[PDB]
Amino acid sequence: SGRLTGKVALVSGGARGMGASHVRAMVAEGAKVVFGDILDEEGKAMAAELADAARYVHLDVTQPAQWKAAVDTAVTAFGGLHVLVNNAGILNIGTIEDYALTEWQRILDVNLTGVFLGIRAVVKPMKEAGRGSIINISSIEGLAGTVACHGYTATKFAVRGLTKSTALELGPSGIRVNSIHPGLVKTPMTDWVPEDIFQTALGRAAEPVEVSNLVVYLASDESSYSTGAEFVVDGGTVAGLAHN
Amino acid sequence: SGRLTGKVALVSGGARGMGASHVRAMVAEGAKVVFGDILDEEGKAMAAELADAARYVHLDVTQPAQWKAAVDTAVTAFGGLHVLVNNAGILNIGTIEDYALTEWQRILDVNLTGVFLGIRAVVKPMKEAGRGSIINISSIEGLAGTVACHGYTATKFAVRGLTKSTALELGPSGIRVNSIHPGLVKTPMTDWVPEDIFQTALGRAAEPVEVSNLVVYLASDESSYSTGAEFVVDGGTVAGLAHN
Amino acid sequence: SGRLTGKVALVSGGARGMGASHVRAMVAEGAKVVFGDILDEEGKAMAAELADAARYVHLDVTQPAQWKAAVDTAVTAFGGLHVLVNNAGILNIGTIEDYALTEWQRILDVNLTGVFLGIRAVVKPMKEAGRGSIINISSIEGLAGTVACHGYTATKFAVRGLTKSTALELGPSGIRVNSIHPGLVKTPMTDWVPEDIFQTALGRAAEPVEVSNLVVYLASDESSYSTGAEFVVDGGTVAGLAHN
Amino acid sequence: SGRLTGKVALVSGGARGMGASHVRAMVAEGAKVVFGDILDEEGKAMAAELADAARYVHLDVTQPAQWKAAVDTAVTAFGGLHVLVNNAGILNIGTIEDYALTEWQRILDVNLTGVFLGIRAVVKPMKEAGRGSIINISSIEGLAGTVACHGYTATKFAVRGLTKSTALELGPSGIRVNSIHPGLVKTPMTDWVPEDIFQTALGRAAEPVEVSNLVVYLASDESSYSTGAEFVVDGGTVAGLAHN
Ligand SMILES: NC(=O)c1ccc[n+]([C@@H]2O[C@H](COP(=O)([O-])OP(=O)(O)OC[C@H]3O[C@@H](n4cnc5c(N)ncnc54)[C@H](O)[C@@H]3O)[C@@H](O)[C@H]2O)c1
Ligand SMILES: NC(=O)c1ccc[n+]([C@@H]2O[C@H](COP(=O)([O-])OP(=O)(O)OC[C@H]3O[C@@H](n4cnc5c(N)ncnc54)[C@H](O)[C@@H]3O)[C@@H](O)[C@H]2O)c1
Ligand SMILES: NC(=O)c1ccc[n+]([C@@H]2O[C@H](COP(=O)([O-])OP(=O)(O)OC[C@H]3O[C@@H](n4cnc5c(N)ncnc54)[C@H](O)[C@@H]3O)[C@@H](O)[C@H]2O)c1
Ligand SMILES: NC(=O)c1ccc[n+]([C@@H]2O[C@H](COP(=O)([O-])OP(=O)(O)OC[C@H]3O[C@@H](n4cnc5c(N)ncnc54)[C@H](O)[C@@H]3O)[C@@H](O)[C@H]2O)c1
């Protein structure tokens, strides 16, 4: 408790799934949270139950103007902005033959460009504050490949890289940038996926809060010397070789 | 030797720099090469000296129709297509604040989407042949970050990941996909960069042919059991830790 | 908070430096800690101030019998053992020609075998508890090489690998195994090294507690879905490319 | 053919398996080869059929004196020494509970120390020549973990690291050092292992010559700008995530 005292965070894609879990987890640690999404109905709903510590904003991460508005909301409503959780993302699949180029561009827009746009938008207030933490949500698909998962793999790897380039540039201003790489997490994005799809050492899929616990760590000043790094929370999948 | 005799290859961005070096290197090893670029003047120039061993075609890697035309050219002129070298690429830079969104979009289109389009275009002729080798040109900027080099870092990391997802999917068809990661290479793309910018064990920048030698290895059947892997040719930069 | 209340931990090399910082940090979070070392003077000294929260034991990590005695101490004094911090280690250097074989053998014994012996010693009490967290201290020298630092590099890379093999094997028993990779940390091991030797995004060396914060996270149940993974705390060094 | 003209190489563990394959492959490319092992019967046998281009020497890689003798044999019998293939290795397994410490030390001695001793022994003549290539045989077990494979995993990771530290130190002298990481290869070491143990994109185990082709590339001057790097030849295993 209180591990995020005085902190203000902005979470993209926070109306449901892991994003919603991150909002709740940070609020529980004392942070004020602005969360944006395109699911306004659900967004306003949870904002009502977290009203005193969180605010919902309509945010399509593919639009820079909306990102600016989200950041201004945090600054004007809560006083500042110290944490950014680039969580918004989509999942589409397809083999090289069936995958539509429109699907490829769409996932690049949301999963990659959306993350970059978020970073661009939060740096001004963070630099003025002299401190900040940017947490980009990648995945283990950003560490290795998967059949018929080209756009998703490409963007998750890209996010992994962008985390490092921005980390190097922003470090001198007191802003850390790290990426989180989870394995299968029980959320609506993978509800159709069997929980044991991956070979894991722990033998189970993850609960969203297990990823939120990592977000809290990275958002807090406890992780003050970690930047440009990959934090894996996958139950051990990438730690082992793929066996038959 | 004639390490590539019987092989037909398609090289993007082959009008100059490493691309041109790769075309010459493979032709020297007995390959028939179709190479495309947007620099038609220079492209047609070298096509003339390479005689009946190589054909030049205008190819903007961001356009799927042009990729298809280049592949059709290779199949009709040489009877098939067994090797693809996704070499075309651009370099732009800028801090998070100053970097233009148009530049970000353009580099994603050329460096990332262009590579994916190349893969899509060659799958058919390669699967028909039951064999194939796709070589994607990433870089050490696809292994670590660089200040004010976000679009480039993101795309090179993306290419690294796409190499893996496609390798897994195409393996069953006898097609290998690998990525090459060079350090500073002496070409027009980085002629404005001091040659000793990187801390190398070899204490020098790379010569294009030194990368072409790796392209030949991966294009040949000698590398038959290597796929989805990263081949680093950087003089030792990423093998060491960055010192101040 | 009391993020480790109820947990019992064993820390090797806990008489000074990071080890001592880890013991203090975990005790502050409610853990009961048994810490061992070969520096008995300093070890007993801090055990006295930590009072009933910590016990000091002489522990040469190269000796299996001493590891067993330390574990028995933890179980008898605190009722069990849930966390192991394999922190003991030494640093020696030398060029390929000048580096003494005795030094190579000694560092393998302490930095590598010592870590394995620790893992062996705690498996029983942890499996009995059905839970556990093993934290192995590697370093960025376990991610990249360093001139005239062969024994150290080899062992730190080995620890990184051992972390994975054991994580996979122990996962089914509810035991997590992860590795920590710090950059330059201000301790007596590297006091002879200039603090700005590495190119860091944060432009400074690490403080021991900054690593201890990561140890606490991994020791706590908050990191329940992370195992077999590398946690980097280097201020951004490995996230960037080495410049000359 | 002739890709190793004028080159003299030393191969440890070359009496059978991959080592024997490497000897044959390099001899076929014009290299003179001294190969050492502890299987003298078999060693002298193949030396008789390759007599004009290869010489067998008794070499226990755990003994520095024997390494010196092997190097002197290459220098005095063939005129110099330009390539070293640290191939000698053993495989033992066991869970944390059953694995004997004698087995652990033995594999550290052969797989790790043996490799270091080889590097120490070849540097003198290589530095005098001003050029050389050291090829260390690691494995994908040096990139990820495996249950009940602790000593093997630890040593293969260690070899991976030692490759980088030595590469950085030796680069200025014109000596490159790289590591090879193969997947399952059909040799007597894994004859008891099912060929489809790993999930591979190519759907088959490797033939030793497929690894030897990589040794030839790295031994040749074609790979002149690659050093401190990992070359994976595993049919795509590590390129993908472990799925059930
Ligand atoms: N579910 C998993 O197993 C898993 C594993 C690794 C990584 N991830 C990543 O975690 C993130 C969240 O995943 P999730 O499991 O909660 O999925 P989810 O579908 O539940 O939530 C994603 C959220 O992003 C919002 N969103 C989508 N497009 C948006 C846009 N253009 N602008 C703003 N908001 C947008 C969605 O409405 C939704 O609320 C994603 O980046 C995903 O790739 C998920
Ligand atoms: N120069 C280096 O140091 C270095 C280091 C690592 C990686 N690389 C990569 O190697 C590749 C080639 O680099 P280079 O050094 O020869 O650069 P270069 O500028 O000399 O050549 C790149 C070529 O691509 C062509 N090209 C650009 N956009 C194109 C498009 N849309 N369609 C078709 N062709 C297009 C250019 O006209 C040019 O001929 C790039 O992918 C680059 O990122 C270069
Ligand atoms: N100092 C750094 O910058 C740095 C960076 C990365 C990793 N590390 C690692 O962190 C660990 C602790 O480092 P430190 O900075 O506190 O060094 P340190 O010298 O201050 O402490 C190491 C401790 O281990 C003890 N020790 C040594 N050999 C032992 C043995 N055989 N049995 C039991 N105890 C033994 C020492 O007496 C000492 O108390 C080591 O594994 C080291 O490699 C240190
Ligand atoms: N077989 C595989 O699938 C596979 C996969 C990855 C890596 N590797 C590695 O490749 C290398 C060769 O493997 P292999 O498949 O040919 O095994 P192998 O058993 O056929 O050959 C290993 C050789 O090393 C020799 N040797 C063993 N201990 C020695 C010592 N102390 N001194 C000198 N020589 C010694 C053996 O007598 C034998 O000729 C090893 O390092 C192994 O770990 C093998």
**CATH code for the domain in which residue C144 is found:** 3.40.50.720
Best residue in B216, B226, B233 to probe D by mutation, most D CBs within 10 Å? B226
Ligand 4 atom at minimum distance from D109 CA: 31
Among D13, C234, C20, CA closest to A223: C234
Alpha helices in C79-200 (DSSP H): 101-107, 114-129, 150-170
Q: Is the Cβ atom of C12 under 6 angstroms away from ligand 3?
A: yes
Whether B168 contacts B228, CB under 8 Å: yes
D185 is in an annotated binding site: yes
Helix (H, G, I), strand (E, B) or coil at A27: helix
Taking the CA atoms of A224, A228, A233 and A236 in sequence, report the sign of the dihedral they define: negative
C230/A232 CB distance under 8 A: yes
Contact between chains at D104 and C123 (C-beta distance less than 8 A): no
DSSP string, chain D: --TTTT-EEEEETTTSHHHHHHHHHHHHTT-EEEEEES-HHHHHHHHHHSTTTEEEEE--TT-HHHHHHHHHHHHHHHS---EEEE-------B-TTT--HHHHHHHIIIIIIHHHHHHHHHHHHHHHHT-EEEEEE--GGGTSB-TTBHHHHHHHHHHHHHHHHHHHHHGGGTEEEEEEEE--B-STTSTTS-TT-B--SS-SPBPHHHHHHHHHHHHSGGGTT--S-EEEESTTGGGB--B-
Contact flag A201-C233 (C-beta cutoff 8 Å): no
User: Which pair of tokens denotes residue A158?
Assistant: 């890209």
- Asked whether A56 and A36 are in contact (CB, 8 A), the reply is yes
Q: Which residue of B has its CA nearest to A106?
A: B113
| Residue type for position A122 | V
Decide: B130 and C231 in contact? Cβ < 8 Å: no
B147·A167 Cβ contact <8 A:
no
Which of A103, A82, A77, A179 lies closest to A137 in space, CA to CA? A179
Packing angle of the helix pair C64-78, C114-129 (nearest 10 deg): 30
Strand order in the sheet with C83-86: C54-58, C32-37, C8-12, C83-86, C132-137, C175-182, C230-233
* Catalytic site residue from D56, D152, D217, D225: D152
- The Cα–Cα gap between D141 and D156 comes to 6
**A43 Cα to the center of ligand 1, angstroms:** 14
Q: Which two tokens stand for residue C179?
A: 């590795």
The answer to whether D160 and D106 have CB atoms below 8 angstroms apart is no
Ligand 3 atom 25: residue of nearest CA: C13
The Cα–Cα gap between D144 and D141 comes to 5
How many angstroms separate the CA of residue A221 from the nearest CA in chain C?
9
Spatial neighbors of D82 by CB under 8 A, at least 6 apart, are: D7, D8, D9, D126, D129, D131, D132, D133
The tokens 């490799």 sit on which residue?
A: D115
User: Please, is D28 exposed, middle or buried when counting C-beta atoms within 10 Å of its C-beta (0-12, 13-18, 19+)?
Assistant: middle
Tell me which residue range forms the domain holding B236: 1-244
Q: With an 8 Å Cβ cutoff, are A242 and D199 in contact?
A: yes
The two three-digit tokens of residue A231, written as one number = 């934090």
Neighbours of C194 (CB within 10 A): 10
Query: What is the distance in angstroms between the Cα of A233 and the nearest Cα belonging to chain D?
Result: 14
Q: Which residue has the tokens 């946690």?
A: C231
Q: Match 């989180």 to its residue by tokens.
A: A180
Task: Work out the burial of residue C104: count CB atoms within 10 Å of its CB; fewer than 13 is exposed, 13-18 middle, 19 or more buried.
Answer: buried
Yes or no: say if D35 and D42 are a contact pair by the CB < 8 Å rule.
no
Tell me which method was used to determine the 3D structure. X-ray
User: Nearest chain D Cα to B206, which residue?
Assistant: D225
Give the Å distances, CA to CA, from B202 to B160, B179, C48: 24, 22, 53
Closest A-chain CA to C173: A202
Task: Find the distance separating the first CA and the last CA of chain C, reported in whole Å.
Answer: 44
Q: Is the alpha carbon torsion for B41, B44, B50, B55 positive or negative?
A: positive
Element (H, E) at B163: helix B150-170
Q: Nearest Cα to B235, choosing from C242, A88, A172?
A: C242
* Distance from C-alpha of C28 to C-alpha of C11, rounded to nearest angstrom: 15
Strand segments, DSSP code E, in chain A are 8-12, 32-37, 54-58, 83-86, 132-137, 175-182, 230-233
Residue D48 burial (C-beta neighbours within 10 Å; 0-12, 13-18, 19+) = exposed
Instruction: Identify residues of C whose CB sits under 8 angstroms from chain D CBs.
Output: 64, 95-97, 101, 104-105, 108, 112-113, 116, 119-120, 123, 141-142, 144-150, 153-170, 228
CA distance D231 to C100: 30
Looking at the DSSP bridge assignments, the partners of residue A8 are A32
Q: In Å, how far are C103, D81, D103, D118, D179 from D175, measured between CA atoms?
A: 24, 12, 33, 14, 14
Which of A163, A162, A158, A209 minimizes the C-alpha distance to A182?
A: A209
Interacting residues of A109 by C-beta distance below 8 A, sequence separation 6+:
A62
Report the number of distinct structural domains present in chain D: 1
Cβ-nearest to B240 among C196, C239, C242:
C242
Cα angle B155, B157, B158; round to 5: 60
Q: What is chain A's length? A: 244
The chains found to touch B (3+ Cβ pairs under 8 angstroms) are A, C, D
- Quote the ligand 2 centre to B91 CA distance (angstroms): 8
Q: What's this structure's resolution in Å?
A: 1.8
Question: Which residues face D107 on adjacent strands?
Answer: none
Q: Closest-lying ligand to the alpha carbon of D70?
A: 4
- Measured between alpha carbons, how far is B160 from B180 in angstroms, rounded to an integer? 9
Give the helix/strand (H/E) hosting B102: helix B101-107
A21 Cβ closer than 6 Å to some ligand 1 atom? no
> Nearest Cβ partner of A147 from B120, B163, B168?
B168
Q: Which amino acid is at D125?
A: P
Angle at B144 between CA B138 and CA B147, to 5 degrees: 105
**Interface touch D240/A196, C-beta < 8 Å:** no
Say if residue A16 carries a ligand binding annotation: yes
- CA–CA distance, B15 with B87 (Å, rounded to integer): 11
Contact B96 A144 (CB under 8 A): no
Distance, CA D87 to ligand 4 centroid (Å)?
6
Distance in Å, CA C87 to ligand 3 centroid: 6
Tokens at residue B3, please?
Answer: 């390490």
Q: Kindly list the catalytic residues of B.
A: 152
Q: Across the interface, which of B141, B143, B198 has its CB nearest the CB of C243?
A: B198
Q: Which one, of D40, D43, D47, lies nearest residue D15 by Cα?
A: D43
D6 by Cβ neighbours in 10 Å (0-12 / 13-18 / 19+) ranks as: exposed
Structure tokens at A170: 């922003």
Note whether D137 and D126 are within 8 A (CB): no
How far, CA to CA in Å, does D230 sit from each of B159, D18, D115, D156, D159? 18, 18, 16, 12, 11
How many angstroms separate the Cα of B231 from the Cα of each of A106, B183, B206, B227, D229?
Answer: 30, 11, 15, 10, 8
Active site residue D99: no
Integer Cα distance of C44 and C36 in angstroms: 10
Residue-wise DSSP of A49-95: HSTTTEEEEE--TT-HHHHHHHHHHHHHHHS---EEEE-------B-
Dist CA B207 CA B189 (whole Å): 13
3-class SS of residue B53:
helix
- For tokens 């949500």, name the residue: A137
Query: Interhelix angle for A150-170 vs A114-129, to 10°?
Result: 20
Instruction: Name the one residue in this structure whose structure tokens are 């990959």.
Output: A230
